[PDB]
Amino acid sequence: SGFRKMAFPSGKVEGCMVQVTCGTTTLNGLWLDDVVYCPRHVICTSEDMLNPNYEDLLIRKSNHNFLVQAGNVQLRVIGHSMQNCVLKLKVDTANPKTPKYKFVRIQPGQTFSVLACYNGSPSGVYQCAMRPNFTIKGSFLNGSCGSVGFNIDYDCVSFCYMHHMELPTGVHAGTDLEGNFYGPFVDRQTAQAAGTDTTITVNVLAWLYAAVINGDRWFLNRFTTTLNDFNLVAMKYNYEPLTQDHVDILGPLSAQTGIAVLDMCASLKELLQNGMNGRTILGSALLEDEFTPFDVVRQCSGVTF
Amino acid sequence: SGFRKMAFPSGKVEGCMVQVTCGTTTLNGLWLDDVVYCPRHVICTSEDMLNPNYEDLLIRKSNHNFLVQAGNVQLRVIGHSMQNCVLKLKVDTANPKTPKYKFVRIQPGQTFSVLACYNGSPSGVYQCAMRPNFTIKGSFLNGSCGSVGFNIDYDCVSFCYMHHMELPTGVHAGTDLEGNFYGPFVDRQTAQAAGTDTTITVNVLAWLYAAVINGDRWFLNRFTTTLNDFNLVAMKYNYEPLTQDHVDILGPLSAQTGIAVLDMCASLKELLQNGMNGRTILGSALLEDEFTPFDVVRQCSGVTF
Ligand SMILES: *C(=N)[C@H](C[C@@H]1CCNC1=O)NC(=O)[C@H](CC(C)C)NC(=O)c1ccc(-c2ccc3c(cnn3C)c2)cc1
Ligand SMILES: *C(=N)[C@H](C[C@@H]1CCNC1=O)NC(=O)[C@H](CC(C)C)NC(=O)c1ccc(-c2ccc3c(cnn3C)c2)cc1
């Protein structure tokens, strides 16, 4: 029993982190086989940052200008190229700790673990959701760019995120490992808007099923609703619309608890318009939306990797 | 910017986990040098669990009754002994992945990371505090016993917790790595009380300093207080008394923000008796007490390992 925000074990990803330095700028790189991936803004000086011309900046760079360190060992850079917003540095040595891996572009609402690093060294791990507005609520300081987000499926690491920047609202933005930003963001020092930060409705419902499974049932009411009725109410509170696919994704948790999905929707509806009246659910006084239905099933089932 | 509950990178501990089986009972063991540590209740059957006589149970066991598996490899058990509530299995092979380590008995209020495991395989990592009543709020299912809690200092792993049991209130109890329980608990299937679950006051204040540092300042008020005045109010809300040592531990965060510790106490006092009026602090609608002052400093400073 109990329910916690839980990250994947980070060992397979720790062995892929290196330090990448151009001039005075140092950030993190991901070393997989014989390539190191890192944010392209490693090549900016503080003065290029308002509106950098990355093509013109990169053209002044040679292989030997990139210093790549794995521990106290320098990797020899034998080629470099830009792919969208990431730099790929070809090195003469394949990482002996490369895990089985693939690159994935995740969907809004899906979760992943972040290994926050500085100077190529891990600082900690935490779990994030890709928000509907394609930001994440992370913890990142100067020097954290190139830290990556990932999921693990048994023995295979799915890399889905590399960190690039902070928005004025204090949330975070970055790219997939092909260097394409999530959302409408660009890698320059300008104020950029993410737009309305809507709540991942299917995830809140999964978390409410987790609550029932772990003994918190006070919020279950005597009503049901319809998908259209529920969505008319939830969108007034900036909740994402619930689709029939979402209803079926919740099916196994519904079956496991004996609470119909639309009954849970009616309980969520009442929570939204009446609040929690000073009470808590799984130790929270807000509705939590960063657990997926698969996260809930895995945690309540003890899936291992 | 941003502030998250963050676990230590788990790679050094992942390489120490093994599976330990007696009869039909399988749990996790920690393999360090040539010893495997695990909860002694691996030797119980479901029928011994109400009031087990561990001395009499262990006496019927021989080395070859313990099956220890690291991956698909069996470790040869060449000796066994009971130390308080943990079993120590001597094996004929030293773990080649043993990190630098030590065993530590932590203090109430201190935090650590848990690597939750099943069948010797990691399932995830999360951060916990040792509560004042010597429980933890974890996420543990059948088969999770032997999962460990730890801190990392640069390159040294400090093991502080091994998981044994759940209480009726849904919180969790376990031992240090010398097998001595935290708190008044015993490893049998009886209803056991942990007593009043009081709030770690110094940690709430650290988290409020984290909030100021990360831009949430709405709760700062125009008052100050005294240590005695503050403690008279906080203990009515089941908060731990704040000592002058605690005040000095908060000193660097106070210096970094320019908010005197007793001014922050007066802001906490008003939060306790007036609530948060529907507002949030660092994304929470409750006062969070599972960040230590050192946790806050490390995270706001980017300390790496
Ligand atoms: C990578 N190492 C950092 C990670 C940042 C540092 C602080 N927290 C993080 O997550 N990445 C950078 O420093 C980025 C580099 C550029 C080239 C992409 N830049 C930013 O993250 C960044 C920060 C702040 C602003 C900003 C511009 C204008 C603003 C405000 C607020 N008001 N205005 C008018 C913020 C832009 C870019
Ligand atoms: C280790 N693999 C498990 C971990 C437990 C399983 C569920 N969640 C956990 O953290 N450890 C055990 O199963 C323990 C084995 C004994 C020998 C220590 N036992 C328990 O964890 C346990 C669970 C429940 C109770 C209990 C007894 C009496 C009760 C209640 C509630 N009301 N009453 C009257 C609970 C005792 C021990």
Residues A91 and A240 in one domain: no
Residues A155 and A62 in one domain: no
Which residue, of A47, A80, A99, is where some domain finishes? A99
- Burial track A37-50 (b if 16+ CB lie within 10 A, e otherwise): bbbbbbbbeeebee
Residues B193 and B214 in one domain: no
Catalytic member of B22, B145, B160, B265: B145
State CA B294 to chain mean position distance: 15
Residues B79 and B182 in one domain: no
Residues B270 and B282 in one domain: yes
- Tell me if B291 sits within 8 A of B249, measured CB to CB: no
Of A58, A290, A39, which is closest to residue A175 (Cα–Cα)?
Answer: A39
Q: Is B24 exposed, middle or buried (0-12, 13-18, 19+ CB in 10 A)?
A: exposed
- Tell me if A257 sits within 8 A of A214, measured CB to CB: no
Is the CB of B304 less than 8 angstroms away from the CB of A117?
A: yes
Q: Is B117 on the interface with A (CB under 8 A)?
A: yes
Q: Which of A27, A189, A192 to mutate to test the pocket of ligand 1 (most atoms within 8 A of CB)?
A: A189
Residues A176 and A296 in one domain: no
Is the CB of A121 less than 8 angstroms away from the CB of B304?
A: yes
Determine if ligand 2 sits within 6 Å of the CB of residue B31: no
The Cβ of residue B86 has, within 10 Å, a number of other Cβ atoms equal to: 26
- Tell me if A174 sits within 8 A of A142, measured CB to CB: no
Residues B72 and B221 in one domain: no
Of A279, A147, A259, which is closest to residue A208 (Cα–Cα)?
Answer: A259
Cα–Cα distances (Å) from A136 to A114, A162, A164, B144, in that order, read 10, 11, 11, 31
Q: How many CA atoms lie within 13 A of B198 on its CB side?
A: 18
| Count of domains forming chain A | 3
- Residue B226: CB partners within 8 Å, gap ≥ 6? B262
Residue with tokens 């008279």: B232
Cα–Cα distances (Å) from A185 to A252, A269, B173, B301, in that order, read 37, 33, 46, 26
Cα gap A258→A247, rounded to integer Å: 14
Cα gap A204→A227, rounded to integer Å: 15
Q: From atom 17 of ligand 1, which residue's Cα is the shortest distance away?
A: A188
State the CATH number of the domain containing residue A287.
1.10.1840.10
Of B48, B304, B13, B37, which is closest to residue B163 (Cα–Cα)?
Answer: B37
Residues A187 and A276 in one domain: no
Full residue range of the structural domain in which residue A149 is found = 1-14+100-197
State the CATH number of the domain containing residue B185.
2.40.10.10
Of B195, B268, B197, which is closest to residue B231 (Cα–Cα)?
Answer: B268
Q: How many CA atoms lie within 13 A of B49 on its CB side?
A: 11
Is the CB of B9 less than 8 angstroms away from the CB of A14?
A: yes
Which residue, of B168, B197, B226, is where some domain finishes? B197
Q: From atom 37 of ligand 2, which residue's Cα is the shortest distance away?
A: B189
- Tell me if B48 sits within 8 A of B61, measured CB to CB: no
| Cα dihedral: A78, A83, A85, A90 (round 10) | -20
Determine if ligand 2 sits within 6 Å of the CB of residue B164: yes
What distance in Å separates residue A60's CA from the closest CA in chain B?
Answer: 31
Residues B6 and B124 in one domain: yes
Cα gap A18→A5, rounded to integer Å: 27
Residues B204 and B295 in one domain: yes
Cα–Cα distances (Å) from B2 to B22, B36, B212, B218, B271, in that order, read 46, 39, 11, 16, 22
**Position in ligand 2 atom list of the atom nearest CA B168:** 31
A-facing residues of B in 25-54 (CB < 8 A) are none
- Alpha-helical (H) ranges within chain A are 11-14, 54-59, 201-213, 227-236, 244-249, 251-257, 261-274, 293-301
**Position in ligand 2 atom list of the atom nearest CA B191:** 28
Residues B245 and B190 in one domain: no
Which residue, of B197, B226, B258, is where some domain finishes? B197
Method of structure determination: X-ray
> What is residue A102's three-state secondary structure?
strand
Residues B149 and B209 in one domain: no
